Amino acid sequence: MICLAAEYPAVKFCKVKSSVISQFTRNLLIYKGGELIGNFVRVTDQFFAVDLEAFLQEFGLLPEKLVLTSVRNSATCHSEDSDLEID
Amino acid sequence: MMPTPVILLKEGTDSSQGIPQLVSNISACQVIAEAVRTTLGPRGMDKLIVDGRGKATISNDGATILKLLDVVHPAAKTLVDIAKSQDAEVGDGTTSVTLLAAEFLKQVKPYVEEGLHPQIIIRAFRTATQLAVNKIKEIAVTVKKADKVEQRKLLEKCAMTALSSKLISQQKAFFAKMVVDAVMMLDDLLQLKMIGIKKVQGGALEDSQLVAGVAFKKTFSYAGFEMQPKKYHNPKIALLNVELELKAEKDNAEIRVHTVEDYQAIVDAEWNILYDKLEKIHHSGAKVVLSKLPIGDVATQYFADRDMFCAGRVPEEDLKRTMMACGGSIQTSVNALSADVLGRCQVFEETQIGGERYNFFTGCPKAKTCTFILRGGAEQFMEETERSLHDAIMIVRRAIKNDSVVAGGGAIEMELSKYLRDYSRTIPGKQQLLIGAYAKALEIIPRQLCDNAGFDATNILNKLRARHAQGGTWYGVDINNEDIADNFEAFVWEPAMVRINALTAASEAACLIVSVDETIKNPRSTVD
Amino acid sequence: GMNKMVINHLEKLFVTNDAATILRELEVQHPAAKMIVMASHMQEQEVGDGTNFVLVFAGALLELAEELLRIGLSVSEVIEGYEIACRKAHEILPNLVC
Amino acid sequence: PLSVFGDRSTGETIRSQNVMAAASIANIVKSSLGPVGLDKMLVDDIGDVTITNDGATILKLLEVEHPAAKVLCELADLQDKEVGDGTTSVVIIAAELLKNADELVKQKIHPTSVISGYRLACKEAVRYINENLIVNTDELGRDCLINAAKTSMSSKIIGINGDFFANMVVDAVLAIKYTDIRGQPRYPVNSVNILKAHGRSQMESMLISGYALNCVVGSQGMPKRIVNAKIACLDFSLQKTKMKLGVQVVITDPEKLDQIRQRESDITKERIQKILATGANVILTTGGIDDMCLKYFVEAGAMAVRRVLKRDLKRIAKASGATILSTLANLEGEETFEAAMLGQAEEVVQERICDDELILIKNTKARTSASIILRGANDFMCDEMERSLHDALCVVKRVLESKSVVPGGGAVEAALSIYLENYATSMGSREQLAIAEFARSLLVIPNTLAVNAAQDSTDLVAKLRAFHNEAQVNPERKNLKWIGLDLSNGKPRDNKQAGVFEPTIVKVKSLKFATEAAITILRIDDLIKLHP
Amino acid sequence: LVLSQNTKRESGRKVQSGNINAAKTIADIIRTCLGPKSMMKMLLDPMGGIVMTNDGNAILREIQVQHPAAKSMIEISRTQDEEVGDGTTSVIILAGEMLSVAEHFLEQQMHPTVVISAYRKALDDMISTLKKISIPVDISDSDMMLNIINSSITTKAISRWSSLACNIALDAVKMVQFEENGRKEIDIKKYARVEKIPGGIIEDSCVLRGVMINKDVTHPRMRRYIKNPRIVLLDSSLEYKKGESQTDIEITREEDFTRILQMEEEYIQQLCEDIIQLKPDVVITEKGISDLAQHYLMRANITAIRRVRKTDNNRIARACGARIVSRPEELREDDVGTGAGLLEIKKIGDEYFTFITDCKDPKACTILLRGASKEILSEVERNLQDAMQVCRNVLLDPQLVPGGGASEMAVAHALTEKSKAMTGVEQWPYRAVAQALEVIPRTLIQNCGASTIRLLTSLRAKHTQENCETWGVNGETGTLVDMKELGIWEPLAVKLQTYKTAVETAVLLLRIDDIVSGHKKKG
Amino acid sequence: ASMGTLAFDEYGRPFLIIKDQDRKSRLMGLEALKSHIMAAKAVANTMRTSLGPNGLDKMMVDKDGDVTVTNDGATILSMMDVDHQIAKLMVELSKSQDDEIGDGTTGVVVLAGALLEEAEQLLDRGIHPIRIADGYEQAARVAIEHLDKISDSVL
Numbered sequence A: 001m002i003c004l005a006a007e008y009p010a011v012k013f014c015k016v017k018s019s020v021i022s023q024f025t026r027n028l029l030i031y032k033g034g035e036l037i038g039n040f041v042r043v044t045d046q047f048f049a050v051d052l053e054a055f056l057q058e059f060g061l062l063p064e065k066l067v068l069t070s071v072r073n074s075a076t077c078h079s080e081d082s083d084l085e086i087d
Numbered sequence B: 001m002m003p004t005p006v007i008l009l010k011e012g013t014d015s016s017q018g019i020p021q022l023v024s025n026i027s028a029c030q031v032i033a034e035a036v037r038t039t040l041g042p043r044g045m046d047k048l049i050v051d052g053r054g055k056a057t058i059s060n061d062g063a064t065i066l067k068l069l070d071v072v073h074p075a076a077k078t079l080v081d082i083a084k085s086q087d088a089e090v091g092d093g094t095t096s097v098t099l100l101a102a103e104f105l106k107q108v109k110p111y112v113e114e115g116l117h118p119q120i121i122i123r124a125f126r127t128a129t130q131l132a133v134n135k136i137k138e139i140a141v142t143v144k145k146a147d148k149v150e151q152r153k154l155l156e157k158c159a160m161t162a163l164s165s166k167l168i169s170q171q172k173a174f175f176a177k178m179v180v181d182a183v184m185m186l187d188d189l190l191q192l193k194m195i196g197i198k199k200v201q202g203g204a205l206e207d208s209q210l211v212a213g214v215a216f217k218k219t220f221s222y223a224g225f226e227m228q229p230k231k232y233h234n235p236k237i238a239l240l241n242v243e244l245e246l247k248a249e250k251d252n253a254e255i256r257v258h259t260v261e262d263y264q265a266i267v268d269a270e271w272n273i274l275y276d277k278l279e280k281i282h283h284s285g286a287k288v289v290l291s292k293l294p295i296g297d298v299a300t301q302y303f304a305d306r307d308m309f310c311a312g313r314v315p316e317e318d319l320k321r322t323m324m325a326c327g328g329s330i331q332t333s334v335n336a337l338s339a340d341v342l343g344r345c346q347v348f349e350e351t352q353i354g355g356e357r358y359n360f361f362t363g364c365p366k367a368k369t370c371t372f373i374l375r376g377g378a379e380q381f382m383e384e385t386e387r388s389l390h391d392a393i394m395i396v397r398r399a400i401k402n403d404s405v406v407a408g409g410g411a412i413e414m415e416l417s418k419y420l421r422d423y424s425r426t427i428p429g430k431q432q433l434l435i436g437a438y439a440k441a442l443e444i445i446p447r448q449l450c451d452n453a454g455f456d457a458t459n460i461l462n463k464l465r466a467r468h469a470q471g472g473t474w475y476g477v478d479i480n481n482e483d484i485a486d487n488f489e490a491f492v493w494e495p496a497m498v499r500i501n502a503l504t505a506a507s508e509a510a511c512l513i514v515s516v517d518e519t520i521k522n523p524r525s526t527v528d
Numbered sequence C: 001g002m003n004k005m006v007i008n009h010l011e012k013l014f015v016t017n018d019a020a021t022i023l024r025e026l027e028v029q030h031p032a033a034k035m036i037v038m039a040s041h042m043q044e045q046e047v048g049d050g051t052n053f054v055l056v057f058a059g060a061l062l063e064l065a066e067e068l069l070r071i072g073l074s075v076s077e078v079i080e081g082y083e084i085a086c087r088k089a090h091e092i093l094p095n096l097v098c
Numbered sequence D: 001p002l003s004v005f006g007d008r009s010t011g012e013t014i015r016s017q018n019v020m021a022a023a024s025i026a027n028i029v030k031s032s033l034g035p036v037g038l039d040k041m042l043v044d045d046i047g048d049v050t051i052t053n054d055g056a057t058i059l060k061l062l063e064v065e066h067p068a069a070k071v072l073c074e075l076a077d078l079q080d081k082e083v084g085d086g087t088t089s090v091v092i093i094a095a096e097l098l099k100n101a102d103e104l105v106k107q108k109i110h111p112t113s114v115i116s117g118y119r120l121a122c123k124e125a126v127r128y129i130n131e132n133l134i135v136n137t138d139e140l141g142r143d144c145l146i147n148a149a150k151t152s153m154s155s156k157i158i159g160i161n162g163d164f165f166a167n168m169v170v171d172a173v174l175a176i177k178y179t180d181i182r183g184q185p186r187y188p189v190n191s192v193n194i195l196k197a198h199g200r201s202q203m204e205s206m207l208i209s210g211y212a213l214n215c216v217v218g219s220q221g222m223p224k225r226i227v228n229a230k231i232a233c234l235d236f237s238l239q240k241t242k243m244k245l246g247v248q249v250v251i252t253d254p255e256k257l258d259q260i261r262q263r264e265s266d267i268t269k270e271r272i273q274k275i276l277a278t279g280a281n282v283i284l285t286t287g288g289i290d291d292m293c294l295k296y297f298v299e300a301g302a303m304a305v306r307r308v309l310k311r312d313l314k315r316i317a318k319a320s321g322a323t324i325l326s327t328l329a330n331l332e333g334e335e336t337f338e339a340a341m342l343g344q345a346e347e348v349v350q351e352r353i354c355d356d357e358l359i360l361i362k363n364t365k366a367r368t369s370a371s372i373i374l375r376g377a378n379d380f381m382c383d384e385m386e387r388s389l390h391d392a393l394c395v396v397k398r399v400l401e402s403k404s405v406v407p408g409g410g411a412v413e414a415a416l417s418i419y420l421e422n423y424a425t426s427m428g429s430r431e432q433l434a435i436a437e438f439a440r441s442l443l444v445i446p447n448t449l450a451v452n453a454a455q456d457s458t459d460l461v462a463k464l465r466a467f468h469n470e471a472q473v474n475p476e477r478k479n480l481k482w483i484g485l486d487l488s489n490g491k492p493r494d495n496k497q498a499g500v501f502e503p504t505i506v507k508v509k510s511l512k513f514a515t516e517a518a519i520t521i522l523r524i525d526d527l528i529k530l531h532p
Numbered sequence E: 001l002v003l004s005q006n007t008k009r010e011s012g013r014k015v016q017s018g019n020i021n022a023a024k025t026i027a028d029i030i031r032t033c034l035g036p037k038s039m040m041k042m043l044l045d046p047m048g049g050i051v052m053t054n055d056g057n058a059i060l061r062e063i064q065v066q067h068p069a070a071k072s073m074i075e076i077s078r079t080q081d082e083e084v085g086d087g088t089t090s091v092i093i094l095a096g097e098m099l100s101v102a103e104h105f106l107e108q109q110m111h112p113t114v115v116i117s118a119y120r121k122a123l124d125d126m127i128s129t130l131k132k133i134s135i136p137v138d139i140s141d142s143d144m145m146l147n148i149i150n151s152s153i154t155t156k157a158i159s160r161w162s163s164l165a166c167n168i169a170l171d172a173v174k175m176v177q178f179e180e181n182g183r184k185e186i187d188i189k190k191y192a193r194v195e196k197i198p199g200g201i202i203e204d205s206c207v208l209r210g211v212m213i214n215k216d217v218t219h220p221r222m223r224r225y226i227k228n229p230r231i232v233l234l235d236s237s238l239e240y241k242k243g244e245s246q247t248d249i250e251i252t253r254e255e256d257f258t259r260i261l262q263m264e265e266e267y268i269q270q271l272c273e274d275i276i277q278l279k280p281d282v283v284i285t286e287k288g289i290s291d292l293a294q295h296y297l298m299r300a301n302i303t304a305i306r307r308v309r310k311t312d313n314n315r316i317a318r319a320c321g322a323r324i325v326s327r328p329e330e331l332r333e334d335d336v337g338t339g340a341g342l343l344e345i346k347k348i349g350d351e352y353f354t355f356i357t358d359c360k361d362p363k364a365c366t367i368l369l370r371g372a373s374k375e376i377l378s379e380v381e382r383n384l385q386d387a388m389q390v391c392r393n394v395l396l397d398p399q400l401v402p403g404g405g406a407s408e409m410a411v412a413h414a415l416t417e418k419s420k421a422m423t424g425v426e427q428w429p430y431r432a433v434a435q436a437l438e439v440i441p442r443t444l445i446q447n448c449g450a451s452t453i454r455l456l457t458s459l460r461a462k463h464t465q466e467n468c469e470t471w472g473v474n475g476e477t478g479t480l481v482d483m484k485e486l487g488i489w490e491p492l493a494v495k496l497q498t499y500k501t502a503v504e505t506a507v508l509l510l511r512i513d514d515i516v517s518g519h520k521k522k523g
Numbered sequence F: 001a002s003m004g005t006l007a008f009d010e011y012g013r014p015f016l017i018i019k020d021q022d023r024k025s026r027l028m029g030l031e032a033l034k035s036h037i038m039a040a041k042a043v044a045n046t047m048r049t050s051l052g053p054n055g056l057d058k059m060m061v062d063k064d065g066d067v068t069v070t071n072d073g074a075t076i077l078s079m080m081d082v083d084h085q086i087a088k089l090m091v092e093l094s095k096s097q098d099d100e101i102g103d104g105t106t107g108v109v110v111l112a113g114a115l116l117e118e119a120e121q122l123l124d125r126g127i128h129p130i131r132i133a134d135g136y137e138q139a140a141r142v143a144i145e146h147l148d149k150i151s152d153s154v155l
């Protein structure tokens, strides 16, 4: 999922401990818009990154997949006053 | 910072360093002063503090309030320490010391924030304090006449000024006269333990009395006590430290007999030992018997048969006070009960005071002790009355030591501020700002008086400044008239040592707080 | 020098600028700092003053020793030079008595 | 009794709490004031690092919960918006004003009197600045702009390189100069595209006489350099045509499907054929371009750039004289493209900048534009250069619009403090104290400047105040109004001669905003905080 | 609670000391990976892969840190790698040394701004001295370029096969060099692709006069060997596909279904006939080719390859001189790529590879790497990338500067001599950062295993003489050698970039005195 | 209005003055007087119904379940399980009246409650509480003098 995070910036890969929230641990929560969408756990039963990519893409869950600029360009977005030429 | 695989100090050690640490110390001192500001002046208010056990302490004394607080800030505890020091050395001014110290720190905080070296501030405080103490000693009013009536009036005025901020301020004349009368009967050391203070619930404040003698509560009478007479018109008192009851002759003593005749002889011998002690007491001519050790019921009945008064388990302090008042001597042996070891009082009487029985030893002409019997409607009421009387007693004793007085109401501190400002206006200029800050800080007390009274502080401050500048030394705050007045002519008098020690302690606390640049707190051990 | 407010594990409050007292109240854990503290306490016991001098000089010596080790010297050579310089300083010191 | 579900703090408690919050916000940024100031490093929970010195940026990135602190944060943001410089000074002044106002209040001085005194003091300070402490920039010449830019860039990552960065900033600002109706020369800063790229040192930063695009050509077959460019700016996607939602294709005769599919792309083919037949060389579109149109442009030997930002495209069109065309439709109801819609530039190239490429539209005609490429050691450094550069551009724009500047280094603050301390004695009784405290509070800026340099703040500020008092009292010594701090040596110095200026608008706006914020927080005497 | 409960803030000398110490730790991580006697390191990726290298940029990239100063140093390493491609280890070490030197004065009562001003003056003088002590290079002499590349690669694992690697890199760089519309470019990133196939021997590695892709013919009957092919490149699929508009049909007659299928077949045939009209021999597409399209092309004896990546298609176009066309009906004769001297689909191991490797005047190339394993080949690819970056740096800027610490000592001596006329408070940081450049000879000697102090003192004494700017340290024998005899030279651009980046990193990290952390992104 | 002051610094470092200052409440100024007057008024209004021949008894149950039906105000207040400090002060006042006199243990509580109730509206008009206490003392002196004046002797 660390590798997939580079491919899909729009996703919010994260982790959580089981204790901070006994059968819970011994025996992948997908959220979109605040509601559960994907409900797959113990995905090791069903490994490298592109296998997980295909596993999630086969069910229409992962969004469809850009040039690397110098560093960035953005400065601001406000009343620019535009580049008025004359008069 | 980095993990540093081996750490220098214990994990959890907290360190603060630099100007922020010092300004945080100043803010903590400000908080401590704020905790006691409104208890200053004739319009001051009491504070109610409840501990974990649920007991409530109500006080107008700065030292008591500060002690009852669980101050844990290392810098803030210095204010409590200097308040306790002022209480120990003088007994009054426990609020003034904290207010002055915190106001000093508040005044020098702006100069601290701009990177001024703390040693300069310390030197300025030392110079200003020395000059202020010298000025106080110079301008303090003393009368070198040794006049009894004038000295008595000075004592009464000082006591009234010391008492006119507590809940007994309405009867302050009465209590001041009582305190002055009590103090002058102490012989040479003015020991506080020679002035007993008894608190009895029920009764008005004006019902409290000063016994020219000794009085203490009845102490666990045995059977046959009610058959004794309870009033003698010229009794001789046998002060004793003796356990008068049938008991083993000694703890390790053992009796070994092999005859019934010896058994009866032993029983008769024990009875005869007790009766011989009692007969030796009786033949001395004494009519009132007081013992530190218990007096048995057999001894009580024996004394009742002879029309004599007995009282066992009397507290040691009360026996010492009785001995000092009457003139006898505490005896551990009854073999030599001569007339020189028996006290004498004009009248002894057992009376009832609000649901408690008290023994009175009045009429002693050469008594060196007293006994306040404080009446009040509540426990904390009597406790606060005792605290106020303690303040007055300490002031009167210090006045006995030296009769040097200054006018209160901020007049002395206004004069000191004017003098310090005038001095600071004639120095190169780096110390000028700091000495001026000290002089301005000396104005907190009249401002606090006006604020507690509910006045407009700024107008009174301006009027006092104008009057002191144009001539006039003892012009302070007149609470009743909402104006200023010549407090010396208003008999608002304070011993000079009170203000001297207040300024000294406040300056020392301010210098100590300023001198610290870093605080380190090691982790607590055995947290459990 | 500025006084330091030090709170030990028993909540006792010490305010002072005496180096030996500060070291005693501080809960030093690093063994090398412990050794420096022992040297300071030995100075305090033997003479009664100069503990802060001991700390400052030891720290400066160790900093410059680290510099010397970084510039390519060996530990033994630094130790030998320090001992020679200490002997020279002990020789020179009596000549400075005013 | 009140039964309100929440926490109610009233009176001196809430006043002290508000002043504490303001003082904490002040102390957050007090160490980043003046040339001896130092930058701050801010780390998020994600781990992003933002090394900055700008006060507005620092206060915007922080997480603040106390409303009395949020007030100063948005005050800094507003000062940045309407001026662009002095974001730290306004926060410091407002916090000090609030502190001294609370100190006055605790002496039983009513807050209304303090507010009236603050208003009078602010008005009189603005009047005194406008009447005594302004220097007309007409006689100074170009040196005034350079000195103002250098002063603005002091205490920044580009401070030492000011001798070169000020020239860059002045040239960039003068490049975009224009006059509108009423004959007012307006300088539309933020029309200078700032491009960042790590690599060579700061001194290799380039000022582009033209425009710079952070985008490359769509296809590798097109040439990467056009000499006599004919820029065509378009606002529509050049892709296969798709019928709208209201149109649906239903086929009953199979012989028409091939013609339908052919026209589906022949429409775009004809559009591009017109575009290229008018003589165009470079085509910029906000929308996308697919492979077919890219191959059309490749065969034509032209340039085609897709996904150009709308603001960038507008700037390019206005600079080169081209006209944005969201569609090819004339008033005759046809599909045409005239040659009058083409902009011209002396050269259009694609340069490589540290293993990355950007398109340079060089020397446009009918208007002069500018862009700045900043080269730094890493991304954080480039961000700080961009922020400092924007501050310098804003300062230059303010100086060029309003031709009045004031001496820097706390000269204005000291003069105002002396003048207001003198003037307070002639107005009111309690508001006199309020004005005196306002004058005292104005002295925080020189004090902070001295403190940050580890100099004797008290003595240095005393010397400055003595100089300004002599200037005000003596009519003939009036030349000392320019005496300001020189933190390099820690001694007073005539800042006007040394060339330490700043726009008067910065001081005036900071004073007004700080006074308003202090009044707003001073009007509060009770707080109710309901439990969520 | 003014700020957030999780917001942590600290300031003062602690922040400066922590930043300098973190930079020193970053330097110490890779200090032992400099010079011809460097030792390699094994990096274990979080994804399970193993990176085995001694290049500074990769080592610093595969490390995760928390302290922001360490992140800044990592970004400096990345910037140095991306800008010039060499000197990545040197810049980190230099930045650490300058930061330690600055901390020396920071412990005293000197403001950081004075240190920064001294550092900037020293950087300007360093640039001037480096430009002064440079020598020109005749790029037309292949021997000098090969020697420069060798000196660039003596410090890597590829140095065992030095002549082969130098020839490969030089040939690839000279072949990818292109000029159009009066604009010169090298562009190593896009073209001149390095493809690695594990197995074989490194001595069998070579640079092709063309490209090579991992593709096979779409149908077995097509020729796998064409002598002088004519190659046509396409973007569009050769298969029937839907349109953009919704185009539902409505069939009522019996024959319309069969007719529609026949028109699909006829459209495929028409597209294939339009392709065939140019009479090509190889057809390459970035998208699918239909089976009917395969048949129609095969009837014309045309080899077809599909699903070729766009970058590979561009490389093929550059190599064989073709142009990608997305509409077969718009295929001109110029679009057909004549110039590919041979095409051959051969079998390497168990995979089919397509070779176009006899092109005349190709502008793109594929470097075929064959080695023991994937990790060895990855290290070899990184070394070849360093070599090609050095070659293009020399081609763009033909200046040259003595290596092996000779330039460091020469610049340090020049700055020290210049510092004798300052008489200012800032002369001390000037001199102390001038002497900070001696770290490169120091670490060279340390890695060589010889005595640091004696050799460094001897080198300094040698540089005090007048004509000794080229006297450096032999990194593999620990002796003082005149580098105009040893022959270790390196581009001036690399030195300039390294010095600028190190000095500016020190300047950036010296302007920080407060750290605030814990706040959320908030946008 | 409680839990002390929430500043925690002027800079950002911890600021602890009093042990467990997070779990300690505090009342300031006129609000404390209002709360005390309210508690005393509640106690006095409870106790006033048991005044006079037509007074009604109170049935007090202790912690052990024992029952004590009584009219004596001092006993009622002694057995009452108050927690408010001012209520404890009222109980102590009643006990003091019982000790000194033995009668009128209910009149004292009602009188104190009425006095504090009047002092409440006096304070609402801006009079300092010490002035109210002084006026109460003067009026009490006048009332005591009048009581002595109108007294009558018995055999």
Ligand SMILES: Nc1ncnc2c1ncn2[C@@H]1O[C@H](COP(=O)(O)OP(=O)(O)O)[C@@H](O)[C@H]1O
Residues within 6 Å of the ligand: B039, B040, B041, B042, B044, B060, B062, B092, B093, B094, B095, B096, B161, B162, B164, B165, B166, B407, B408, B409, B410, B445, B449, B477, B478, B479, B492
């Ligand atoms: N009658 C009075 N008029 C004006 N001020 C007075 C009067 N009596 C006492 N004061 C002032 O009250 C202050 C003492 O208050 P108090 O709390 O009783 O003792 P402390 O000195 O411990 O604060 C003194 O500074 C004195 O000036």
Ligand SMILES: Nc1ncnc2c1ncn2[C@@H]1O[C@H](COP(=O)(O)OP(=O)(O)O)[C@@H](O)[C@H]1O
Residues within 6 Å of the ligand: D032, D033, D034, D035, D037, D053, D054, D055, D084, D085, D086, D087, D088, D089, D090, D151, D152, D154, D155, D407, D408, D409, D410, D449, D485, D486, D487, D500, D502
């Ligand atoms: N060279 C200089 N000498 C003295 N003072 C200066 C100099 N440059 C700037 N200043 C002063 O330093 C103050 C702080 O500016 P700064 O805080 O960097 O701007 P901002 O408030 O926008 O962050 C300004 O008021 C300016 O007058």
Ligand SMILES: Nc1ncnc2c1ncn2[C@@H]1O[C@H](COP(=O)(O)OP(=O)(O)O)[C@@H](O)[C@H]1O
Residues within 6 Å of the ligand: E033, E034, E035, E036, E038, E055, E056, E086, E087, E088, E089, E090, E091, E151, E154, E155, E402, E403, E404, E405, E444, E473, E474, E475, E476, E488, E490
């Ligand atoms: N045979 C050699 N003898 C001495 N120094 C050498 C030799 N080869 C290379 N160097 C020096 O080593 C440095 C290159 O070290 P290297 O490990 O390549 O670091 P980087 O990967 O950062 O370039 C160059 O400055 C060069 O002068």
Ligand SMILES: [Mg+2]
Residues within 6 Å of the ligand: B092, B093, B161, B162, B165, B391
């Ligand atoms: Mg007193």
Ligand SMILES: [Mg+2]
Residues within 6 Å of the ligand: C049, C050, C051
């Ligand atoms: Mg000593």
Ligand SMILES: [Mg+2]
Residues within 6 Å of the ligand: D085, D086, D087, D152, D391
């Ligand atoms: Mg600025």
Ligand SMILES: [Mg+2]
Residues within 6 Å of the ligand: E086, E087, E088, E152, E155
């Ligand atoms: Mg190298």
Ligand SMILES: [Mg+2]
Residues within 6 Å of the ligand: F103, F104
């Ligand atoms: Mg009755």
